[PDB]
């Protein structure tokens, strides 16, 4: 007829102008002929602007558009663990139906002021740089930002892989961190390779992948972060912990800009829509730490932004920096030189800080970011080749070794206990008599020594979290002395 | 009488009317799936249709829904019922503390106070905080800027200002949280509960009313939520005739939200971005029947790392260097400054003592590298003396806060303006060179220094 049904006037570029649909509400899902879904964004006087989630080349002017009578919602629950889905929650891994027992609205208002609790629990990436210098907590939002090929995706994947060491321990005071990876505008092949790594390590067991690839239409790229957040909110709202990774939000903003301009909405700054900040702010506000009265669950976010030529002053980067609780800036010049993870110590920060660390980590990690920022400043000064006094030389020698200690390859996360001892070793002068060349070699042997010869010390630090002082410090000193004798 | 929704384009909602066309800035009401939705009139489009900005989400709105014209602008609860509560932009409680049972309501948009009843000449607002009152005094009706990163006692300062205006002036305070992180909004509330500026069990005796429109909220809400806060502050000024504080964290977000709204209504886009208020500026002023003083938490997107006047009458610069010397509050006594630090406003004595104190601290700073590298014996006798007075003065600028009492145990203090001027004048003259340095640390006026000296 006209009220509950409409007629397609025009169609193209993932958008459709539809006559009729008088009783359709804004943001409502609609059905096109061949099972193709779409969302109503523009209610106009003489038409309805629809953003199309499926393939638009099938649709032709004249077709029947039908109301679903519901706002865009997606499946959720533990049934999505192990699975790869699109932005609407349809599986794309060929492993049969999802069979979810719950459904959630994709784009929703974040929890208010009262149900929250201060972030006080570690969300361990397993990387020495991040966990010691820019520690992420459960319920925090921590931006990962930098150019292409600065290792942003690799940091996020390592974080997911690290959780296996602490997961499935619903007994020793350890909630499982369920992971949600969101691919937005990546190549299909790049996602397949990431999934392949998750499955072969076993990390797929506790992970859900949501994919809106470069080949998928812009409305799926726009939606995927919201839909995946709703999937993450299942855990947060039912007394469980989750992690979500938006890889990346630069392409969600690009997708949003395309849809908006195709709906003839006005251009804002850099041609993005006027509320492009609100796009990301309402998303990231949904990541939170709830109090005991609301189940004590949490959703942590690692949003990713791609800069161009290190331009962190750009518009979309500036927006997301002003949203999150600190950032990890990965730099091209450091990456080019093999300093990986390529953490710029001066620009990177965690606003949560020590609250997101263990007592052990807190007791040794404190001065490390400042020392490494100062070191890099001094090394830059040393290039000029003016006179360096003995005190300056001592810092350069120390910081060069600390730089090597912060280097870390892919797929090789360390536990909290392991990082604490490595940080202790560097800061207390145990590598001073070891050449700069051989620091990573020296570290590799130490970790093997610690895992084989002092597993009891590592398990003791894990379960009985204390500051590195008194008896625990003697055990760490002895462990390092013991290792020093094997290396000699 | 009523109108109906013709279009919905995100936050932008068009409403066609039959009878009287609603004036610009009028609040309209409509039912979005049961819950009421406020809309604010922006433009008249012709064909008897107005163009509005929503104050909440527009998802679920249908064309044809009836829309009521309220007659005036957005109205919000005011008076003592707001004390200790958190309200949103349209005056609804967002603190889960039940209904705001207020007797009066007031419009968020209001014309400025005219030249009649504006208080003649600039006038000091005594905070009771020695360093501020002496070296960078706040003015009534003035635009104050708090500068500082994390870990320098910025929230502790804000709460003591709330405390002191209640204690020494019988005034009120309003904190407007605009487009900031809800995580940090939660922390601020519970920090305010800890130190007693908000009292959950006796809310009317709280010293501040909160108005929150954080990052999670749409452009229209974040644009107007500051005005909602100002209107609550205006009521406290008019009703009691006292000196009221209007805290804004922060103006960059206020402007950002306004910029979002402008862009959505179809406007082409192109130092003062952080500090420039809108027409809001005219409502911040000192009258015969009290005053509203703006204390703004100065912010830009400078979350990477931790400058001069623009639209400000005074600045309070919190310093990490000053904090690490044990000086609380961590105010930089040289980088902080005021337009009313001028003999024509504060008097000849006030100005001269402040100038001498600055001169001594400046000279002390010039001799800092010599004292660190070589001894105090390296200095001439004349310069040795000024360092001794400077070191006393540094400590004497520090002060214990009533708000800090829950953490430290020590009682706070508010020092009268004259006590501050006379005490520092005496120290500058050298009347108390004989007293030890520790006596000047963490006390009120000079009589507390004498009392502390006798204890040692």
Residue numbers in the entry:
A (entry chain A): 24 to 511
B (entry chain E): 4 to 273, 279 to 314, 320 to 469
Provide text from the study:
The P. denitrificans F-ATPase is an example of a eubacterial F-ATPase that can carry out ATP synthesis only, whereas many others can catalyse both the synthesis and the hydrolysis of ATP. Inhibition of the ATP hydrolytic activity of the P. denitrificans F-ATPase involves the ζ inhibitor protein, an α-helical protein that binds to the catalytic F1 domain of the enzyme. This domain is a complex of three α-subunits and three β-subunits, and one copy of each of the γ-, δ- and ∊-subunits. As in other structures of F1-ATPases, the α- and β-subunits of the F-ATPase from P. denitrificans have very similar folds (r.m.s.d. of 5.1 Å). Both are composed of three domains.
However the crystals with F1Δ∊–ζ as the starting material were found to contain a heterodimer of one α-subunit and one β-subunit, which had formed by dissociation of the complex under the conditions of crystallization. The final model contains residues 24–511 of the α-subunit and residues 4–273, 279–314 and 320–469 of the β-subunit. Despite the presence of ATP and magnesium ions in the mother liquor during the formation of crystals, in the structure of the αβ dimer no nucleotide was found to be associated with either of the subunits. The nucleotide-binding and C-terminal domains of the β-subunit are in a conformation similar to the open or empty conformations in βE-subunits in almost all of the known structures of F1-ATPase, and therefore the αβ interface appears to correspond to the empty or open catalytic interface of the P. denitrificans F-ATPase. However, the αEβE interface is more open than in bovine F1-ATPase because of contacts in the crystal lattice. Thus, the global r.m.s.d. of the αβ dimer from P. denitrificans compared with the αEβE dimer from the bovine ground-state F1-ATPase is 3.0 Å. Although there are no nucleotides associated with the P. denitrificans αEβE catalytic dimer, electron density interpreted as a phosphate ion is associated with the phosphate-binding loop or P-loop region (residues 169–176) in the nucleotide-binding domain of the α-subunit. It is bound via interactions with residues Thr173, Gly174, Lys175 and Thr176. The current structure should be helpful in the interpretation of the structural data for the intact F-ATPase.
